[PDB]
Amino acid sequence: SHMKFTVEREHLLKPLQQVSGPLGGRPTLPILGNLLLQVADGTLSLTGTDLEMEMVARVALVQPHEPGATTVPARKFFDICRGLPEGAEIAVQLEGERMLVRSGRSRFSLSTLPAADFPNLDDWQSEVEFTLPQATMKRLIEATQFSMAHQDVRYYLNGMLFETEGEELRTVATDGHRLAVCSMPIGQSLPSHSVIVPRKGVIELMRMLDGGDNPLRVQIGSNNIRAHVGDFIFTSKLVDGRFPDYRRVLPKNPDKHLEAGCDLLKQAFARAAILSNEKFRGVRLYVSENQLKITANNPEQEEAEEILDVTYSGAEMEIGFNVSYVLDVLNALKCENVRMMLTDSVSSVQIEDAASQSAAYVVMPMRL
């Protein structure tokens, strides 16, 4: 191939870092360990992929260049660029099946694989499109991502529901024990639609949101989702499956409302957790007039007890929880006071920020 370019080190590092995101992590096919490099019309494009998602970065070429393409080992190429001195100019060209990298008195010959072999995601058509602030997308994912399933047999929970309704973008994540849902206004009228993004793609979308006054442009097809921020384009296949309806898992008539300081509540659960069962992490809540008591004990018969002043006037009751599920919610709620809505010992609890209803969390209890 004719491909040639020379680019300063600092223009390459962040793109190489971003497009390497989808790469593992248990090799599969050798070309999947390579980045696709393409030069055309004064632009260098870099692509990495795991066959399910891909990340693309564009770099402007202001120095002499020649069009072409190849694929190169991502970790070796990244380390070469990162290892060169600050300010270095990195010259690249192909000689036969080898990629030559030269900077000053450093020279490297890398083995390549043909660009024609690189599995890039196939052509697909956009059906829903909108723009939103990156901070909004970031808040929506951060607010729910921890409740996603991981390696669950119900493959449709190993991901996150993205749902457009009215003026809102909504995310839902659940593993069948706990659920998180967050809605944010988008300031544009959208069709009613919902897709499942795989959890690995959710994570990389979250890690691409860095920059400043750049907006985030989203395109959703029938089988794919695409996000454009600045010079980076993320694309992922969608999960083909039916997602549970968060509207139906919400507690239907909670008659007991507790309100408490988020920091003090989180710290009491964290300390009680220390003497909980290491495998099951069960803790026990007793609520009474303006009082909350958290207890925990383990197979060695050790015991923790925490008492907190809360705002509660409902009937006294006792309920068990996996303390990690509760602490995930309270760590996600970066707020002053949380509200807990309860029904009985065998029913789900809904947890939210006492001052905001944009996010809600539902956690199923444990049999005490």
Partner: peptide, 5 residues
Amino acid sequence: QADLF
């Protein structure tokens, strides 16, 4: 551990 659904 009870289930949501």
